[PDB]
DNA sequence: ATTATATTAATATTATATTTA
RNA sequence: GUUGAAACAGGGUCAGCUUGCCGUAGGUGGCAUCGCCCUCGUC
């Protein structure tokens, strides 16, 4: 419950940085603060915010890429929980540094998307 | 500077339109779930009166605050580079171009703006600040789909016969949106708000539903204006109780309203001439 | 990964919006501006002014598809999942407002697959 | 997953609209726009006006169809629909606006069954 | 779920037009265009144009029944009924024209029904 | 003391008479 | 029964005394439900 939630502020920050190349005050610096404690109270408005980035992307396909490995990160989330405990902030951590390193890699998102 | 503080009850409703749509849900006017009453932003009655100013003006010393060809990093450069440049050590630099912009413009000196961007020159925390509006009754969407007989892009949505582009044009019957607002005193002596300044924009609140119109917005017309004018700086009671004595409810057997001939504005000016004042401007 | 029998309001809600994106998205694949692109901001908090609009232009969206049948698998799986909805909430809770995008995600990934939707379809 | 007697006005009244389309749709296989593509645009909202023309084509819509027990067991169900439906209202609220897609689609699926509607009809 | 004391326009005319289809249809089972197929497209508008003719139908109708008794009832309904229609209006107003097929569908269902009309009969 | 940047999937649910002293 | 025996982590300590998420901003430019149809053939 933690750690795919880690992957997911990843990726939602991966696709605002795509959205704005010269991003200031990003979801992260805004919403870090809870995301890592109160998962229903950030997420209830990143995923909200997260179409219109989407929509916001020059490049259709890879909003499309995007939008398909965040459903594969949330589709082993059955709900969002009320609180991360300690050790799920750990998660969430870890995987938002996996999932932001997994996407800044050559040729990994695209290969794993085509292979659906 | 003005000194006295005014508690304003505006009260404005719309015809057939669309007035303060989209809370990101298409184009929808802000409605409560739970009931249905309407509900306007202040940004909407804010920018009808700085398009009123911008028509009836055109002079210096009250910046209008430019559509979209205004970026707000330029106009901050070309602030700053006026008396104080270089020569007045960052600190109260930003201060100094704070009131400079405060004594300039009168979008920052009624309400406010972010000048925090590049060249940072402090921010205004603003006197007069007005709140959301909200209607008493629950109002109903009706939501007028319309056509178009020409397509847009050139998209695979083009058909080879019609090019039609159709969509949503949502429309509300009535609604008298009770809005709400307070003016305060210790930042309107620092942003250099006067009391012309006051009497400028109590007149845009008046007669901006008269030329800020467009065809989603349709015909929107403000009710009255009751302003609380008080006598010092201190808190005399409570506004709650101030903006309850004005009420709005429905008339006789009614579901529903459709015009003025259907609310009743009951006004009992009793109990606040202790130490306030009373005037109507729109109403 | 999609629970079908969870009985919570905001699962059905978000496979809802789900299943009307991707029906306005199969309708054109040149579309710009998308119902999740203005829609989804008051979804979850606002679905009694918003999921109106979605019902109404839900048979246009179903006409607009160049295959009947798949309009036809559309509304049966919509109607699958509005089966646990049994009334269309003023407001979701916090918990609820997650389980929105939860389902909605989770509807998304079972509709963008090869072989699930049809297979579902076909046992009934 | 349908609540026939929830004593709503909106739910009665989707239920209402969802067996007028499928009375539409089992009129004739062959039909490009049907009521839903036109008259749900307005039906949650002006349903004083929708309904009416629905009822004045219901009859010729139940004609056209080649089985006459089906005809009877759909007015069957509309008339126990419409049961709770104790008058036509001008403007459905918001909580009605979302229970009036509620009703329709949960009518549809209830529709689109095996053995449920003529059951449902026998115990009569 | 039928108001006899509603005192409305529209209810007791689509309560009147019911008991007029039923009696029709009881009067030949084998009947393949009613008078819903035809007088309802405009029995909510022009009233007038369409009972006169409803009404000089009636005896003859209330005659090819059967049973004599079943036509004394269905007279005895169709009057109580009309005791609150003070006059044939021109044209009926948006609730009125929702109100007839109201009260058309709300009598249908208490007309098809076991021991009811019977029961009200009863007690008169 | 950065990275990366182009489209998943789409062909039909259902469909046979309440009630009539 | 003559060959490693005995073994304190302690007595016990407020992690605070506290700090405005904000200053604040138009879903918009606006778009014909249309170009159309004998209630009939008639007893």
Not at chain 1, 20 to 48: C, K, W
Not at chain 2, 124 to 153: K, Y
Not at chain 2, 246 to 266: A, C, P, T
Not at chain 3, 40 to 57: D, E, N, Q
């Amino acid at each position: 419950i933690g750690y795919v939630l880690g992957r997911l502020f990843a990726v939602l920050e991966k696709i605002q940085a795509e959205a704005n190349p010269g991003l200031n005050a990003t979801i992260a610096d805004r919403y870090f603060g809870s995301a890592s404690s109160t998962p229903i109270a950030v997420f209830g408005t990143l995923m909200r915010l997260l179409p219109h980035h989407l929509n916001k992307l020059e490049f259709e396909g890879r909003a499309v890429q995007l939008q398909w490995e965040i459903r594969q990160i949330l589709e082993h989330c059955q709900r969002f929980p009320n609180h991360l405990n300690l050790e799920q902030q750990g998660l969430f951590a870890i995987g938002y540094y996996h999932e932001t390193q997994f996407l800044f890699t050559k040729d990994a998102l695209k290969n794993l998307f085509n292979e659906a | 500077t003005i000194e006295k503080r005014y508690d304003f009850v505006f009260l404005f409703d719309v015809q057939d339109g669309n007035p303060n749509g989209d809370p990101d849900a298409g184009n929808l006017p802000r409605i409560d779930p739970q009931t249905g009453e309407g509900l306007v932003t202040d940004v909407c009655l804010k920018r009808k009166v700085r398009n009123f100013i911008q028509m009836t003006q055109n002079d210096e010393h009250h910046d209008i605050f430019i559509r979209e060809k205004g970026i707000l990093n330029n106009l901050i450069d070309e602030a700053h580079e006026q008396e104080n440049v270089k020569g007045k050590e960052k600190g109260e630099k930003t201060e100094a171009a704070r009131q400079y912009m405060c004594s300039r413009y009168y979008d920052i000196r009624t309400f406010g703006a972010v000048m925090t961007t590049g060249k940072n020159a402090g921010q205004v925390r603003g006197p007069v600040q007005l709140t959301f509006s909200r209607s008493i009754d629950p109002i109903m969407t009706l939501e007028h789909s319309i056509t178009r007989m020409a397509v847009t892009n050139e998209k695979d949505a083009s058909e080879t016969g019609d090019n039609r582009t159709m969509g949503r044009k949502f429309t509300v019957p009535y609604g008298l949106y009770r809005c709400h607002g307070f003016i305060s005193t210790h930042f309107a002596k620092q942003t250099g708000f006067s009391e012309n300044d006051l009497e400028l924009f109590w007149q845009a609140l008046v007669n901006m539903f008269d030329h800020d119109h467009s065809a989603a917005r349709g015909q929107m017309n403000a009710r009255g204006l009751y302003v609380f004018e008080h006598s010092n700086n201190l808190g005399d009671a409570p506004a709650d109780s101030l903006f309850k004595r004005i009420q709005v409810v429905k008339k006789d057997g009614v579901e529903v309203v459709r015009s003025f001939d259907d609310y009743l504005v009951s006004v009992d000016d009793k109990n606040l001439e202790e130490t306030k004042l009373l005037r109507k401007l729109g109403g | 990964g999609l629970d079908r029998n969870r009985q919570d309001i905001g699962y059905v809600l978000g496979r809802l919006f789900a299943v009307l994106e991707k029906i306005q998205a199969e309708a054109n694949p040149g579309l710009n501006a998308t119902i999740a692109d203005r829609y989804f901001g008051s979804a979850s908090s606002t679905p009694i002014a918003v999921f109106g609009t979605l019902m109404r232009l839900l048979p246009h969206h179903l006409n607009k598809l160049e295959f009947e049948g798949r309009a036809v698998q559309l509304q049966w799986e919509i109607r699958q999942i509005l089966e646990h909805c049994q009334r269309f909430p003023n407001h979701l809770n916090l918990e609820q407002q997650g389980l929105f995008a939860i389902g909605y995600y989770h509807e998304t990934q079972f509709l963008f697959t090869k072989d699930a939707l049809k297979n579902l379809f076909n046992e009934a």
